[PDB]
Each structure stands twice: as C-alpha cells, then as structure tokens.
Amino acid sequence: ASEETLAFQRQLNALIGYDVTDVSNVHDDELEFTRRRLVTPRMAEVAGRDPKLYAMHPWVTSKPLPEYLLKKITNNCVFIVIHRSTTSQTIKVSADDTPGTILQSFFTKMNERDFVLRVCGRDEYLVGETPIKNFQWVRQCLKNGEEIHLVLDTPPDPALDEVRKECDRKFRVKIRGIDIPVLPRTADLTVFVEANIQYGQQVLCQRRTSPKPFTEEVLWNVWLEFSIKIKDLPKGALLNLQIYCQLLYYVNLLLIDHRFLLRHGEYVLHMWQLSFNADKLTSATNPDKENSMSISILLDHPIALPEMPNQLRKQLEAIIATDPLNPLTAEDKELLWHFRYESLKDPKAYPKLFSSVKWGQQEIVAKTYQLLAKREVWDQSALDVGLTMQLLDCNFSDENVRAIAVQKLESLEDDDVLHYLLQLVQAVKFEPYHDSALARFLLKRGLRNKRIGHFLFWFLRSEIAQSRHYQQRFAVILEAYLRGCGTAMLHDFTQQVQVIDMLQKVTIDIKSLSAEKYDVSSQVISQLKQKLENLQNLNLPQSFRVPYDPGLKAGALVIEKCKVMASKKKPLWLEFKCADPTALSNETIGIIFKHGDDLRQDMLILQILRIMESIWETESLDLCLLPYGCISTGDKIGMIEIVKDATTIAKIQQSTVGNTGAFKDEVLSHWLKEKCPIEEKFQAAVERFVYSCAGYCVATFVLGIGDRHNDNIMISETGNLFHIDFGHIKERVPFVLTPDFLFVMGTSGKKTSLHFQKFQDVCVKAYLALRHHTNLLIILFSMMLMTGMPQLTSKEDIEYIRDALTVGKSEEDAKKYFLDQIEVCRDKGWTVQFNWFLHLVLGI
Numbered sequence: 001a002s003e004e005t006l007a008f009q010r011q012l013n014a015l016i017g018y019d020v021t022d023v024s025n026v027h028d029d030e031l032e033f034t035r036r037r038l039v040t041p042r043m044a045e046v047a048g049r050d051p052k053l054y055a056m057h058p059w060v061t062s063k064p065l066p067e068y069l070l071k072k073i074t075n076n077c078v079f080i081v082i083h084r085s086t087t088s089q090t091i092k093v094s095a096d097d098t099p100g101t102i103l104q105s106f107f108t109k110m111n112e113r114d115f116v117l118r119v120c121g122r123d124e125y126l127v128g129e130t131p132i133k134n135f136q137w138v139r140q141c142l143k144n145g146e147e148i149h150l151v152l153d154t155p156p157d158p159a160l161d162e163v164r165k166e167c168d169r170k171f172r173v174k175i176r177g178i179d180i181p182v183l184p185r186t187a188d189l190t191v192f193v194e195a196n197i198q199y200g201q202q203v204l205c206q207r208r209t210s211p212k213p214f215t216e217e218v219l220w221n222v223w224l225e226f227s228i229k230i231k232d233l234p235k236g237a238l239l240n241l242q243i244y245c246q247l248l249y250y251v252n253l254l255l256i257d258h259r260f261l262l263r264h265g266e267y268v269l270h271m272w273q274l275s276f277n278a279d280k281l282t283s284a285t286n287p288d289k290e291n292s293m294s295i296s297i298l299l300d301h302p303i304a305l306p307e308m309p310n311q312l313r314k315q316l317e318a319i320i321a322t323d324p325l326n327p328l329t330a331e332d333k334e335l336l337w338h339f340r341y342e343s344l345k346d347p348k349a350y351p352k353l354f355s356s357v358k359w360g361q362q363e364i365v366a367k368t369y370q371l372l373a374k375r376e377v378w379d380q381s382a383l384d385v386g387l388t389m390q391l392l393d394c395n396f397s398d399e400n401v402r403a404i405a406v407q408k409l410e411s412l413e414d415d416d417v418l419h420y421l422l423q424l425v426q427a428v429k430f431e432p433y434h435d436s437a438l439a440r441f442l443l444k445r446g447l448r449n450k451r452i453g454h455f456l457f458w459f460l461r462s463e464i465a466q467s468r469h470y471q472q473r474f475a476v477i478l479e480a481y482l483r484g485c486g487t488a489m490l491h492d493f494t495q496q497v498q499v500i501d502m503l504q505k506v507t508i509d510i511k512s513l514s515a516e517k518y519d520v521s522s523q524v525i526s527q528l529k530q531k532l533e534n535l536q537n538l539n540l541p542q543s544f545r546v547p548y549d550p551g552l553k554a555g556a557l558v559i560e561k562c563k564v565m566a567s568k569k570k571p572l573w574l575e576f577k578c579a580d581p582t583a584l585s586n587e588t589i590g591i592i593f594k595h596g597d598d599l600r601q602d603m604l605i606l607q608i609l610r611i612m613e614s615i616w617e618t619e620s621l622d623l624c625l626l627p628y629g630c631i632s633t634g635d636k637i638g639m640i641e642i643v644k645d646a647t648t649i650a651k652i653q654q655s656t657v658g659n660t661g662a663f664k665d666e667v668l669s670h671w672l673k674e675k676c677p678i679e680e681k682f683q684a685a686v687e688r689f690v691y692s693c694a695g696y697c698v699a700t701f702v703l704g705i706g707d708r709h710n711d712n713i714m715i716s717e718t719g720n721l722f723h724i725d726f727g728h729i730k731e732r733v734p735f736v737l738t739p740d741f742l743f744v745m746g747t748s749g750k751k752t753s754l755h756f757q758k759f760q761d762v763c764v765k766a767y768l769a770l771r772h773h774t775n776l777l778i779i780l781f782s783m784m785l786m787t788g789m790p791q792l793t794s795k796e797d798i799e800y801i802r803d804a805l806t807v808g809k810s811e812e813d814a815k816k817y818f819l820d821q822i823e824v825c826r827d828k829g830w831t832v833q834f835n836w837f838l839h840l841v842l843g844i
C-alpha cells in the first residue's frame with residue numbers, strides 16, 4: 001500500500017462522498033466482498049471498449065425518424081454549416097451519409113483525414129458508421145427548425161481516458177433485548193418485538209414477544225420458533241425485526257449470506273426509526289450508534305446448495321390480462337401455478353405467475369427454476385421495458401427471476417438506457433444483495449458510454465449523499481465505476497464536485513440572512529457578489545462540465561448578473577460564460593442552486609416527462625414540453641437549469657394588476673403579442689402555447705399533480721408553457737386551464753374556437769397515446785412513490801394513476817373522460833387560483 005495507492009482511495013472517497021472502505025458500520029463483509037467481485041466486470045468492460053468511440057461518445061438512435069421530423073426534411077436532404085475559424089461553408093448532404101462521407105465530400109467541394117465534426121460550442125461529436133439523421137443533435141436541430149453548425153477540429157486523444165493500474169428443524173431466533181440511550185416524552189409507553197421472515201415484501205411467517213413497559217433497557221431472552229423449516233428458506237429471505245409501541249424501530253438481516261451460508265452467531269443490530277417504501281427493505285444498519293435503538297439477538301455451517309378446457313383457459317387469460325395493481329386470489333394463484341407451462345408461453349404473465357409461487361417451500365422453488373430453465377419463449381420475446389421493470393420491483397427477491405429481467409435490458413441501446421437510467425438506478429434498492437445482475441448491468445453500461453456514465457455518477461451520488469439506508473451499497477457501485485471511467489472523466493467529476501461544494505456553502509450562507517421575511521437586502525446582494533469574487537479569485541475552477549448537460553462547458557462567473565432570488569428559500573441565480581470559444585453566441589448559462597426543496601422529487605418527475613415525450617414520439621407527437629435539467633447534488637440541495645426568456649404566469653398577472661386575486665383574462669395574450677412583434681412569431685408562439693399547454697395538461701393530470709398555483713407555471717417569449725416547482729406535491733381542478741390560457745387560444749366565454757379545438761384534439765391524441773403504454777406508466781409511477789417519497793406510500797396512492805388512465809375503459813369512453821376534465825376547468829374559471837392566492841400568498 002504505497003502512498004500512491006492510499007492517495008487514490010482518498011480522492012475516490014472524496015468524489016464518492018462516502019468512505020467505501022469504512023467498516024465501523026457492518027456485521028459482516030458483504031460490502032468488501034462486492035468491491036472485490038466487481039473488479040472483474042469492471043476490467044472486462046474497460047478492455048473491451050473501443051478507445052476512440054469511447055473518447056468522443058457519439059450520441060445516436062436506431063429508431064425511425066418521427067413523422068413530425070419527416071416534414072422538416074425535403075427530399076432526403078440536409079444542410080450543415082462547417083466552420084474553420086472565421087471561415088465557414090454550407091453544404092447539402094444526403095440524410096444517409098456517414099460523418100466520413102461528409103468530410104470526404106467536404107474536401108472535394110472546397111495527415112489528411114485526421115479531423116472530425118463536432119458541434120459548435122459543445123463536446124458533442126458526430127462520428128461513427130451511422131447516418132447523420134440518426135444523430136440526436138441533428139434531430140434536435142430539425143425539430144427546433146434550427147441550423148446545424150459543426151466545427152472541424154482535432155479528434156480527442158484516447159490516451160486521456162487512460163485507466164490506472166489495477167435441516168428439518170424449524171427456524172428459531174432469540175430476542176435478548178433492546179437498548180436505547182434516551183426515550184420520548186410521553187413516557188408511559190409499552191413495546192414488543194415482532195419478528196418476520198420476509199421475501200418479496202410478503203411475510204412467510206411471524207412471531208412476537210410479550211408486551212412490556214418502554215424503558216432504556218428491555219430484556220426478554222425469549223426463544224421465537226417459526227414454523228417454516230431451515231431447508232425451506234429461500235436465498236434472499238429477510239429476518240425483519242420490528243418494534244411496536246405502532247411501528248417505531250426496524251432493522252433487517254439476510255438469513256442467507258452472499259456466500260450461501262446460514263446466518264448464525266450473536267448480533268447487535270442498530271435499527272432505524274420510523275417517521276410501504278424502499279428503505280424498510282435495506283440490509284444496512286443505522287451508523288449512528290450513540291443515539292439509535294439496538295436489538296440484540298442470537299441464532300442457532302449449513303450451506304444452501306445452488307391442454308386445458310376452454311372456460312379454464314379463458315379464465316386464465318382474463319387474469320393474465322389484468323393490470324399490474326390488481327391483486328390475485330388464492331384460486332387465482334393456484335390456477336396460474338397449476339398451468340405454469342401454459343402461462344409461460346406468454347411473457348405478460350411472468351409477473352403474475354412468479355408471485356403465485358410459494359417461495360417458502362424448497363420444492364416449489366426448485367420446480368420454478370426448472371420451469372425457468374426453458375426460456376426460449378422469453379429469450380425470443382420482444383423487449384418490453386414495462387414488463388421487465390415489473391420483475392425488478394419490491395415484489396421479487398429471487399436472484400434468478402430478476403436476472404432474466406436484467407437479461408432483456410441488455411438489448412437496450414444507450415439512447416434508451418438514458419431514458420430509464422434513473423428508474424433502474426432506483427431499482428437497486430430492491431435488490432437483496434449488494435452484488436447483483438442489475439448492479440453489474442449499470443456498472444457495465446457506464447464504463448461503455450460516457451453520457452450514461454456521467455449521469456450514473458450524479459444519480460448514485462445523490463443517493464449516497466442523502467440516503468444512509470443505501471449509501472454503502474451505492475458507494476461500492478460508484479467506486480467500481482470511478483475505477484474505470486478514465487483520468488479525463490475522473491478530472492471533470494473533480495471540477496464539478498469542487499464547483500458544487502463551494503457554491504453549496506454560499507447558497508446556504510446566504511439563506512441564513514432572513515428566512516421568514518422576503519426582502520433581498522441591498523447589502524445581501526452586495527455580500528453575495530463579494531463571496532463569489534473571493535472564489536473566482538483563482539481558487540474556483542476556471543471551468544467545469546454542467547452536470548445536467550455534460551455537453552456544455554461552463555466558464556467564469558458573470559458576477560454582475562448573479563443575485564439572490566426574491567424567493568422564500570432564497571435560491572441562487574448564477575450565470576456563467578460558455579468556456580467554449582467555438583460557441584456561436586454570447587448567451588450565458590443560467591444555473592440555480594437551491595436549498596429547502598427535495599429536488600430528488602423534481603428530478604424523478606422531470607424524468608417521467610422525458611419518458612412521455614419519447615412515448616409520444618413512437619406515435620409521432622410533439623407536445624413541446626420543457627423538461628429542464630435538475631440534479632439533486634446532495635442533502636436538500638441541488639441545481640436547476642435556467643430557461644432563458646421565461647417568466648411566472650402569476651408575475652404576468654401581477655404586473656398588469658398587482659398583489660391581488662383580481663386576475664384578468666387578456667393579460668397573457670397581451671404579454672405574448674408584445675413579446676412577438678414579428679407577426680410570424682406570434683402565431684408561432686401561439687401554436688406553441690396550444691401544444692406546450694396541452695402537453696403539460698395531459699402529463700400533469702396522469703401524474704396527479706395538476707391542481708397547482710399560478711406561480712409554479714412559466715411561459716417563454718417564444719410561447720412555451722412549462723410547469724416548474726415540482727417540490728413535494730374544497731375546490732379542485734384536474735389541471736390548470738385558466739381563463740388567461742383559454743383566452744390566448746381565442747376563447748373568452750364557454751364558446752369553442754379554432755385553436756381551442758386544436759388544443760382539445762391534441763390533448764386527446766396525447767392522452768390516448770399514453771394509454772397505449774398504461775402498464776409502463778403504472779410501474780414507473782409505483783417505483784417512484786416507493787423510492788422517491790419520504791413518507792410511506794400505499795396501494796391507494798398507486799391506484800390513482802390507474803383511474804386517471806381509465807384502465808379497462810374503451811378509447812371512446814376515455815376520449816370523452818378527458819374532454820370532461822377539460823370542461824371542469826372552464827366551469828371553475830379563476831376559482832381555484834384565487835383560492836391558491838388566498839392560501840399561499842395570504843396565509844388563510
């Protein structure tokens with residue numbers, strides 16, 4: 001262990017945000033065991049990735065050009081502007097030419113082929129054997145009807161990515177006692193210990209102890225013998241110890257360790273306090289010992305060795321045809337299991353079929369593995385993310401069952417992996433062991449692609465920072481990725497963390513000045529610009545990669561424009577210059593650092609929104625949403641992308657009117673027209689509004705976050721509406737379709753209109769579009785509530801989304817159901833908003 005070896009670890013831990021070597025909080029060696037087992041897969045991806053292609057991380061898609069983009073193109077032709085210093089030429093190529101057939105054709109028109117096409121002002125290269133039309137930037141430019149400016153520069157040297165040198169007896173447990181240093185005020189409490197043998201979130205068995213008075217020390221020394229036999233215990237089963245006073249304390253212990261051994265010996269586990277969700281499933285113990293409740297137990301080297309009639313048929317398919325949230329009956333399960341090989345021929349049955357398994361029985365499980373052995377039908381089925389996601393949630397704990405889900409994920413191309421990365425990263429919380437297929441799949445895909453890796457870094461880091469329940473597991477996975485991404489990325493991450501940390505302190509040190517009375521003092525803005533000065537001196541990184549948009553390189557601070565927002569939680573409105581000189585503009589980079597809101601929620605919501613945009617893509621729809629970047633940098637803090645030329649709808653009302661609820665109906669249209677002097681840009685901004693508005697209307701409704709204050713919705717000087725603050729979230733409305741909105745669509749009273757009719761038809765089209773992916777949205781929504789909501793979610797919560805999508809209904813009934821929702825908004829006018837103004841603004 002040279003000084004060099006130690007040094008490396010130190011910085012790694014620094015980047016990680018946690019010390020992955022720490023052992024102060026572990027009752028075994030699973031963590032260390034995983035750090036070692038990931039070394040092979042890590043290296044196995046590193047050496048197998050093309051140095052060049054991994055250096056320029058091309059971003060492409062093998063999906064067909066949507067219909068709304070087909071139009072943007074005229075006769076299989078595209079024009080690209082190539083620049084060389086102040087010399088730039090425009091060329092017209094075929095939408096099927098490769099970036100090489102472009103450079104070659106560029107040397108013809110105007111050592112030798114030692115150059116490459118990069119996007120002006122961005123680290124995004126158009127390279128590889130792929131049609132130019134299959135590059136995201138290209139398709140992005142088309143949609144925005146913008147020009148494609150590329151710069152001819154030198155290809156990065158792959159050397160910069162260099163990687164450093166490398167029993168029939170019934171099971172029984174003994175509860176000795178619980179110890180807690182201090183206790184609650186209401187002190188005439190009573191408590192007992194509930195021991196459960198869980199698996200897949202369902203209890204196979206349960207035992208309890210005699211209730212006793214709640215004291216700083218409670219002994220029992222009672223033997224608890226369950227009914228299930230030691231031989232029946234399935235690998236992945238959990239011994240969930242809980243304390244009731246109402247549940248208050250809980251801790252879990254894997255009965256079968258990572259080595260297939262039966263857990264034994266004396267244990268003193270430090271439990272978690274309850275304030276259902278992902279956290280109640282963790283194997284991790286509470287690190288804080290001096291304050292947490294502790295359970296002392298005892299355990300008894302046993303090793304776990306590695307046709308049908310028409311109405312019956314028609315009743316089987318009826319169950320299989322059921323949605324995800326519909327439970328199963330005793331008969332339901334018995335029917336699914338009896339006909340395993342028949343329910344096996346249909347992939348959409350797997351979830352249902354594998355929950356009908358009696359895992360608490362060695363025999364049944366063994367048969368299951370046999371059943372699974374023959375997976376031709378599955379292996380050859382078409383990838384279905386929604387179906388695959390269902391096998392990765394809290395309902396399954398069998399290593400083999402989950403493994404086949406991951407198996408199908410292997411088919412996803414980088415572009416799609418990017419859409420579901422966040423969700424899949426959260427799914428790790430559902431794994432019973434630190435080392436898993438899903439865990440290795442992510443590690444692998446991160447080392448195989450810089451964009452996937454960049455986000456995998458922050459995604460994991462957000463959880464490492466504010467989740468003591470899973471920071472140990474994630475930290476091991478992050479390290480594994482940091483030990484194989486390269487020295488270049490290892491450097492960017494450093495610059496980014498540095499910039500972040502420094503700005504974090506400031507953001508918080510500024511908020512400390514007035515937290516109950518909005519009033520951005522003149523002196524505060526004076527001190528703010530001062531603290532940044534001290535940093536920009538030479539201590540702050542000259543530049544850094546923007547965490548939510550890695551293709552962008554931020555430079556120096558434009559202290560002049562920086563300020564503290566006139567917001568309650570007083571966030572920071574920072575602006576940077578683009579560190580890239582080849583950029584074709586002078587616009588700054590607006591970044592918002594905020595403390596107070598749980599950005600993990602926004603981050604998750606924003607992601608579903610991106611999932612909905614692509615979903616509409618499959619149907620050739622463009623709702624003009626604006627899922628601005630947002631990354632939870634750490635505990636209660638993170639950044640927010642600033643959308644240029646945009647304001648709050650409320651602000652729009654306040655200017656005309658003021659700090660009153662006497663909302664007008666033309667103010668908005670008067671604000672947009674004023675902004676769009678160029679006529680051709682009004683009707684354009686108007687159609688935009690109709691779509692963006694409709695877009696958010698549909699999406700927001702389905703997610704059950706439509707009733708919202710006028711201050712959390714924004715509009716751009718280009719007519720783009722987009723909801724913002726997704727923080728936590730009598731009269732009520734399905735979504736926001738206020739009079740000022742319907743007005744811009746040329747509709748004063750309850751009278752229809754051309755644009756309003758356009759609006760409606762779009763809403764329906766988008767609404768029906770999502771319904772085709774009901775199952776996908778149902779599972780994502782559920783995982784989100786389980787891993788993204790501080791409180792404990794329930795079935796009721798999940799089922800909402802189901803109703804919103806009107807599952808079971810026909811397209812017609814559906815189409816209508818949404819048109820009625822649109823009506824409520826018309827019959828509610830400014831009612832709701834006025835209430836929000838009265839509630840939020842007045843405190844009533």
Ligand SMILES: O=c1c(O)c(-c2cc(O)c(O)c(O)c2)oc2cc(O)cc(O)c12
Nearest residue numbers: 597602640641642643644646724725726
């Ligand atoms: O407090 C917030 C805020 O002010 C803005 C904002 C975004 C823009 O794009 C602007 O142009 C602007 O003026 C403000 O976004 C947010 C987005 C969130 O997810 C959460 C937030 O709390 C805010």
